[PDB]
Amino acid sequence: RASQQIPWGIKAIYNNDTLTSTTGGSGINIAVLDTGVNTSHPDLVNNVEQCKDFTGATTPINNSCTDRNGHGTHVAGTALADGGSDQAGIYGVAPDADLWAYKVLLDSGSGYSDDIAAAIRHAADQATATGTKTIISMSLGSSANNSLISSAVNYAYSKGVLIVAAAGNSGYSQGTIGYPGALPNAIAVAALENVQQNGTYRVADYSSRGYISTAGDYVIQEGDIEISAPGSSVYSTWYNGGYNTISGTSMATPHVSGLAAKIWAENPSLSNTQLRSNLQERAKSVDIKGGYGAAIGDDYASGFGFARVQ
Ligand SMILES: [Ca+2]
Ligand SMILES: [Ca+2]
Ligand SMILES: [Ca+2]
Ligand SMILES: [Ca+2]
Ligand SMILES: [Ca+2]
């Protein structure tokens, strides 16, 4: 059923060109705030733990998270597909992690800021209620900074949740990074393509860029890109079965959320801040120098660099 069980981006983030399966993530929840998920997909069914809808007339709506788009299923599979109970499917970065499929986007792929905010806060409340470490993964954004979403992100961060979000797809001009990625308490993820330039992976032209003034210090301010990850031509799970290949910072984001879950599961005593520091150090050690604006060191195209397993 799967044309590639270990897609290029999974091999790249593992830093293993002969990888045969992925592993890790046990006990960590990845809350994928998106268009829903195909929770019966063979490669996801073993990890679906929560399924809630934030787009309806009351909120949350439990036991409802149907993907009619594909985007949310695809993102989930990159983060945590587990090969299926027959080992014949695709693998995501953290195949042992738990999926919280939170539908915050309508079937069109667009969503309302109040719904997104509500889901962020709910994921935090569920982390607190259950006593479990949780990563919010948001493959979504806007050029405008919405205060409902920003306040929700701060709330979640205060409760120990890690927030990972797409940089956006409005590149490559300076200052195109969107929100929530551009918030100080969210990890903004830039998209790599499977092309080398200047001896490194290349940032895709579409990936939104941060700002010159605050890039270079290896400290995240508002508007800074943080981590780069594979985003172009990513094979993953799709909503009505099967698989599909699509591109974007939406695809890069779950590579980072999945990596974060893998790392966190190896030491769940890390605070969200300490986990973020681990990721930042991984990234710094793999400096990205390809693509418009990319440079030696921390830069506004690729942030700190490309965080990898080893
Ligand atoms: Ca769990
Ligand atoms: Ca609504
Ligand atoms: Ca940020
Ligand atoms: Ca900075
Ligand atoms: Ca760089």
8 Å CB contact between 99 and 14: no
Quick one: which ligand is closest to 286's CA?
5
Question: Is 53 known as a binding-site position?
Answer: no
8 Å CB contact between 215 and 182: no
Long-range CB contacts (< 8 A, 24+ apart) of 121-124? 121/152, 121/155, 121/156, 122/52, 122/54, 122/60, 123/31, 123/33, 123/156, 123/161, 124/155, 124/156, 124/159, 124/161
- Around ion ligand 5, residues with a beta carbon closer than 5 Å are 287-288, 299
Question: Is 101 known as a binding-site position?
Answer: no
Domain enclosing residue 40, as ranges? 1-310
Ligand 4 centre from 173 Cα, in Å?
18
CA gap 145, 154 in Å, rounded? 13
Give the Å distances, CA to CA, from 62 to 51, 53, 55, 122, 235. 6, 7, 12, 12, 29
8 Å CB contact between 234 and 9: yes
34 a catalytic residue: yes
Ligand 5 centre from 189 Cα, in Å?
14
8 Å CB contact between 110 and 116: no
Helix (H, G, I), strand (E, B) or coil at 22: coil
Find, among 210, 140, 212, the residue nearest to 182 by Cα: 210
Q: Which amino acid is at 283?
A: A
CA gap 249, 57 in Å, rounded? 30
8 Å CB contact between 123 and 136: yes
Q: Which amino acid is at 38?
A: N
Give the Å distances, CA to CA, from 241 to 45, 141, 178, 286. 12, 26, 31, 35
Residue found by looking up tokens 């940032």 in the block:
203
Question: Is 186 known as a binding-site position?
Answer: yes
Tokens describing residue 46: 């073993």
CA gap 256, 262 in Å, rounded? 10
Residue found by looking up tokens 């308490």 in the block:
185
Annotated active-site residue in 41, 71, 74, 122: 71
8 Å CB contact between 268 and 133: yes
Find, among 132, 163, 139, 144, the residue nearest to 265 by Cα: 132
41 a catalytic residue: no
Ligand 1 centre from 199 Cα, in Å?
40
Radius of gyration of the chain (CA): 17
Ligand 2 centre from 113 Cα, in Å?
8
Question: Is 295 known as a binding-site position?
Answer: yes
250 a catalytic residue: yes
Q: Is 175 left (phi over 0), alpha (psi -120 to 50) or beta?
A: left
CATH number at residue 71: 3.40.50.200
Strands 187-197, 227-230: pairing kind: parallel
Ligand 4 centre from 23 Cα, in Å?
32
Provide CB contacts within 8 A for 217, sequence distance 6+: 298
Question: Is 25 known as a binding-site position?
Answer: no
Q: What beta strand segments (E) does 104-161 contain?
A: 134-138
Question: Is 293 known as a binding-site position?
Answer: no
CA gap 47, 261 in Å, rounded? 13
Find, among 205, 206, 221, the residue nearest to 303 by Cα: 221
Backbone angles phi, psi at 14, to 5 degrees: -75, -20
Ligand 4 centre from 257 Cα, in Å?
21
CA trace torsion 168, 4, 51, 264 (10° rounding): -70
How many folded domains does the chain comprise? 1
Q: What share of the chain is helix, strand, coil (3-state, %, to 5)?
A: 25, 20, 55
Q: Which residues pair with 229 in a beta bridge?
A: 191
8 Å CB contact between 239 and 68: yes
Tokens describing residue 172: 């490559």
Ligand 1 centre from 282 Cα, in Å?
26
Question: Is 98 known as a binding-site position?
Answer: yes
Q: Which approach determined this entry?
A: X-ray
Q: How many CB atoms lie within 10 A of CB 26?
A: 16
Tokens describing residue 104: 């915050």
Annotated active-site residue in 150, 250, 257, 302: 250
Tokens describing residue 290: 């390809």
8 Å CB contact between 112 and 43: no
Q: Which amino acid is at 83?
A: G
8 Å CB contact between 192 and 228: yes
Instruction: State the resolution, in angstroms.
Output: 0.9
8 Å CB contact between 9 and 255: yes
Q: 180 preceded by cis ω (within 30°)? A: yes
Provide CB contacts within 8 A for 83, sequence distance 6+: 5, 21, 43, 89, 90, 91, 95
Residue found by looking up tokens 């998106």 in the block:
34
On the 0-12 / 13-18 / 19+ scale of CB atoms within 10 A, 54 is buried
